């Protein structure tokens, strides 16, 4: 089974026996993702155990891939297990279950939906600010993703059920999805391990984190919101699927959100002048420090660029995927039945064929003089078609409020102990090595 | 393979294939060993999946197994995994790394060092009281596992490392050892599955109060205690086996502890008039208050009659086992290497062929008049032999201790909601279904 990319004449490192090329992976999924595209070109394959995968860095595969060929053929991601009563989350869900849940939370987030969401937000954007001007009024370096984590989380629970907690460190026990080294390495390379762990309630989510969130979603049947959308469209929607669904929303909307905005900080410190161009703007938005509305987020043309060239350099995706249900030949290439066709997005955000200087922070590749020159099958970070993230635009949204919130009352320069260069977590997910602590300085 | 008690002539419920006999675990392991006891006689057999299991009720057949034939053939408990590093633990552990543990550990409890930690355990007797007379002058219900978890935590802390800690609910993540249904219904009867999950690094104990354990007795280390023996026997002793020792013990001294004082108070409350006669000898031994000492807890004969007829009721034990690792003969009875001889506890401490009117608590039992008639391989709550309960000596100190200081201070009364009957844990370990809640009043 180690010889299929051999036969279709597609070239890829040479697989160890049970291992395929896994042992690749010591320098983390980018690293190597990065090799093999200097290394063999636009399209080569590998092998996770006896999962053959497709990379593939055409736009045009790319687009049929995520878009075009979306409902037919690459419909479903790459199975994940063992996960008990999480199987029903939307994000692992498969064929018409997924498109049955897909089209029940579209309506979650529309532009109507989003600007009614702009007055919850913009109460946790001065908790944040008090927040941090205590730790700004004592000159102690501020671990960013402890307070971007307490603001994020305050305002998920409000924008899509009714809860609030303010700082009294739903209490966040979003502490579990810890990727690494096994037994994650002993699945992906020897996958018919999940169905037993799945006869014994084994679950990847520990039994802490979902009894806590099991029942809390309990006490959230209060006598529009997401919760509000869903029992609405169940008056048929299980009472375990809801939950299910919930505990999507909890995690992305605390860890991707909180993550992204420290990413974004520490770029904003080790440029000062990119930082004062961006506060320089959002005076002109908003002076007097004026309350940042929906209109207003959409109108700030330098924070959009602030955010997609961070997006750029730490794609929190790094990997897309999609299995192929059946044989096809998609741009005059065969590929078979059961592999998993892959978009190294990290590499492709770096590839110095699409981009000039890959690694320096430029917010001015995507200034509207040269966004022309973007290929948006190579930069996607939220994806791309029918399956792309459903959070997308609340994600950009929320994100930009409390940039402006923040940047509007002080500054951020690096520290001693700042790692500089901010080593990637040479592990599995996006992360840095050492957390993320800046200077706070008050204007 | 289920046939090897019909071919022994040894009589026991018939075993459904693959399952044996877990279905008679429906009203947990202590009904199930009284009926058969009933239903069979002195001698029977049953599975555990495929593991068979002759149970013993002969006094000199358990003397031979728990105490002569100990070293030779009946060494070691049942295997118990997955454990992952905590298989050095004396309890788990085989063989001769067994022996050369128990040794290293046997001087922890000499009565020179049981002594000792008198003027040690004083300390938070009085912890006890001031925390009992807060919820006394209250009129509250007072569960009495957590504040007396709250001490046993207390003590076993300072009395094998120096660490103290004083109610700030080391913080006692002793939580977890959930035993019942899966994923230990799978283990027991499909058990090569335990080298598969050995492999994972999964665990039985979860890896939050591991890892938490694991560091924090690495803080000790400050530069004649336990751990002070450890190292003074280590100067092989790995520094890993170092503290897999260590949860052993703080487990131990909290659960066990904490529930057999729980225990005892709820038959207290429930027969006024032994609570009385306990009273009026502990106000004669140590009148005024008299701070309680080594040589006056032992002198104490009421006390040790409702301590042992509250293990008779209650034995945390319901079973003890030994495997049997080579073919034997004991007692006119051939015994196949492989089967696990186990001893019905539970079932022994009811027997009416030993103990008249067995359910009702009757301390007079063991009274000096009467303890003659009690057999000691009937009667075994910290089992015999070689392997007894290494912290017997030790946890019936710590136990009178705090009976004597508290018993000096308050009384105890049901409540409405005190549960009475008590109802056993219908599950696995031996616990209630309901905690245990009792009205507390100052003297
Ligand atoms: C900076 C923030 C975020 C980024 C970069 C991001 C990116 C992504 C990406 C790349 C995917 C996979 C898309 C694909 O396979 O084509 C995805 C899926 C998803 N995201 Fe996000 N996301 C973000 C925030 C959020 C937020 C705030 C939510 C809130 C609910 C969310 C909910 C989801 C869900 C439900 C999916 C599942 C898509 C499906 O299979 O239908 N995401 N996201
Ligand atoms: C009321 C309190 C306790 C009771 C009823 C009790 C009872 C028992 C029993 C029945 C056994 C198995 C004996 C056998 O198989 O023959 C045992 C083993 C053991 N107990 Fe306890 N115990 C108690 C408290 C403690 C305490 C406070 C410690 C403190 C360290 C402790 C440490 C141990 C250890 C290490 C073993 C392992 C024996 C071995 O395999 O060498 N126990 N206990
Ligand atoms: C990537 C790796 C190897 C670390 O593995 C996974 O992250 N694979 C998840 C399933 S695909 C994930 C989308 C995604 C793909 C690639 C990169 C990043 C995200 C997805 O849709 N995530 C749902 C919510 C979310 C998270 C982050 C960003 N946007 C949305 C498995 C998974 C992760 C975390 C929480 C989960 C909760 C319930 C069910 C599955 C969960
Ligand atoms: C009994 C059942 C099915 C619930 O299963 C186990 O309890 N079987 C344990 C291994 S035999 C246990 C002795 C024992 C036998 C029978 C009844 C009660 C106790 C033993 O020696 N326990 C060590 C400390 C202790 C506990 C209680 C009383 N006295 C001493 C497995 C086990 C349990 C709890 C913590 C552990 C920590 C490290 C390694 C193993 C551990």
Same mark, same amino acid.
């Given at each position: 089974?180690?010889?299929?990319?051999?036969?279709? !004449?597609?070239?890829?490192?040479?697989?160890?026996?049970?291992?395929?090329? @896994? /042992?690749?992976?010591?320098?983390?999924?980018? %690293?190597?993702? *990065?090799?093999?595209?200097?290394?063999?070109?636009?399209?080569?394959?590998?092998?996770?155990?006896?999962?053959?995968?497709?990379?593939?860095?055409?736009?045009? %595969?790319?687009?049929?891939?995520?878009?075009?060929?979306?409902?037919?053929?690459?419909?479903?991601?790459?199975?994940?297990? =063992?996960?008990?009563? $999480?199987?029903?989350?939307?994000?692992?869900?498969?064929?018409?279950?997924?498109?049955?849940?897909?089209?029940?939370?579209?309506?979650?987030?529309?532009?109507?939906?989003?600007?009614? %969401?702009?007055?919850?937000?913009?109460?946790?954007?001065?908790?944040?600010?008090?927040?941090?001007?205590?730790?700004?009024?004592?000159?102690?370096?501020?671990?960013?993703?402890?307070?971007?984590?307490?603001?994020? &989380?305050?305002? @998920?629970?409000?924008?899509?059920? !009714?809860?609030?907690?303010?700082?009294?460190?739903?209490?966040?026990?979003?502490?579990?999805?810890?990727?690494?080294?096994?037994?994650?390495?002993?699945?992906?390379?020897?996958?018919? /391990?999940?169905?037993?762990?799945?006869?014994?309630?084994?679950?990847?989510?520990?039994?802490?984190?979902?009894?806590? /969130?099991?029942?809390?979603?309990?006490?959230?049947?209060?006598?529009?919101?997401?919760?509000?959308?869903?029992?609405?469209?169940?008056?048929?929607?299980?009472?375990?699927?809801?939950?299910?669904?919930?505990?999507?929303?909890?995690?992305?909307?605390?860890?991707?959100?909180?993550?992204?905005?420290?990413?974004?900080?520490?770029?904003?410190?080790?440029? +000062?002048?990119?930082?004062? #161009? /961006?506060?320089?703007?959002?005076?002109?938005?908003?002076?007097?420090?004026?309350?940042?509305?929906?209109?207003?987020?959409?109108? &700030?043309?330098?924070?959009? *660029?602030?955010?997609?060239?961070?997006?750029?350099?730490?794609?929190?995706? &790094?990997?897309?995927?999609?299995?192929?249900?059946?044989?096809?030949?998609?741009?005059? $290439?065969?590929?078979?039945?059961?592999?998993?066709?892959?978009? =190294?997005?990290?590499?492709?955000?770096?590839?110095?064929?699409?981009?000039?200087?890959?690694?320096?922070?430029?917010?001015?590749?995507?200034? #509207?003089?040269?966004?022309?020159?973007?290929? +948006?099958?190579?930069?996607?970070?939220?994806?791309?078609? +029918?399956?792309?993230?459903?959070? *997308?635009?609340?994600?950009? *949204?929320?994100? #930009?409020?409390?940039?402006?919130?923040?940047?509007?009352?002080?500054?951020?320069?690096?520290?001693?102990?700042?790692?500089?260069?901010?080593?990637?977590?040479?592990?599995?997910?996006?992360?840095?090595?050492?957390?993320?602590?800046?200077?706070?300085?008050?204007?």
């Amino acid at each position: 089974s180690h010889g299929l990319f051999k036969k279709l !004449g597609i070239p890829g490192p040479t697989p160890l026996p049970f291992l395929g090329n @896994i /042992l690749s992976y010591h320098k983390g999924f980018c %690293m190597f993702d *990065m090799e093999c595209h200097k290394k063999y070109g636009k399209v080569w394959g590998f092998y996770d155990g006896q999962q053959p995968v497709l990379a593939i860095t055409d736009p045009d %595969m790319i687009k049929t891939v995520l878009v075009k060929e979306c409902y037919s053929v690459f419909t479903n991601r790459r199975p994940f297990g =063992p996960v008990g009563f $999480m199987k029903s989350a939307i994000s692992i869900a498969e064929d018409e279950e997924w498109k049955r849940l897909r089209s029940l939370l579209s309506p979650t987030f529309t532009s109507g939906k989003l600007k009614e %969401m702009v007055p919850i937000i913009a109460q946790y954007g001065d908790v944040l600010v008090r927040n941090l001007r205590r730790e700004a009024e004592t000159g102690k370096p501020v671990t960013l993703k402890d307070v971007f984590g307490a603001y994020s &989380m305050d305002v @998920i629970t409000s924008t899509s059920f !009714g809860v609030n907690i303010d700082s009294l460190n739903n209490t966040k026990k979003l502490l579990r999805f810890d990727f690494l080294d096994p037994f994650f390495l002993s699945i992906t390379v020897f996958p018919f /391990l999940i169905p037993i762990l799945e006869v014994l309630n084994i679950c990847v989510f520990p039994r802490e984190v979902t009894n806590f /969130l099991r029942k809390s979603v309990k006490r959230m049947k209060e006598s529009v919101d997401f919760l509000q959308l869903m029992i609405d469209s169940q008056n048929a929607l299980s009472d375990l699927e809801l939950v299910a669904q919930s505990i999507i929303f909890i995690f992305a909307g605390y860890e991707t959100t909180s993550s992204v905005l420290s990413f974004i900080m520490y770029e904003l410190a080790t440029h +000062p002048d990119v930082q004062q #161009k /961006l506060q320089e703007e959002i005076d002109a938005v908003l002076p007097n420090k004026a309350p940042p509305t929906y209109d207003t987020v959409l109108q &700030m043309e330098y924070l959009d *660029m602030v955010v997609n060239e961070t997006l750029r350099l730490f794609p929190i995706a &790094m990997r897309l995927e999609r299995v192929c249900k059946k044989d096809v030949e998609i741009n005059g $290439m065969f590929i078979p039945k059961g592999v998993v066709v892959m978009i =190294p997005s990290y590499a492709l955000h770096r590839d110095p064929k699409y981009w000039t200087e890959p690694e320096k922070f430029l917010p001015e590749r995507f200034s #509207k003089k040269n966004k022309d020159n973007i290929d +948006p099958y190579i930069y996607t970070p939220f994806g791309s078609g +029918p399956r792309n993230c459903i959070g *997308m635009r609340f994600a950009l *949204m929320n994100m #930009k409020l409390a940039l402006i919130r923040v940047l509007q009352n002080f500054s951020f320069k690096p520290c001693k102990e700042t790692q500089i260069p901010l080593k990637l977590s040479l592990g599995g997910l996006l992360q840095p090595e050492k957390p993320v602590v800046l200077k706070v300085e008050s204007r």
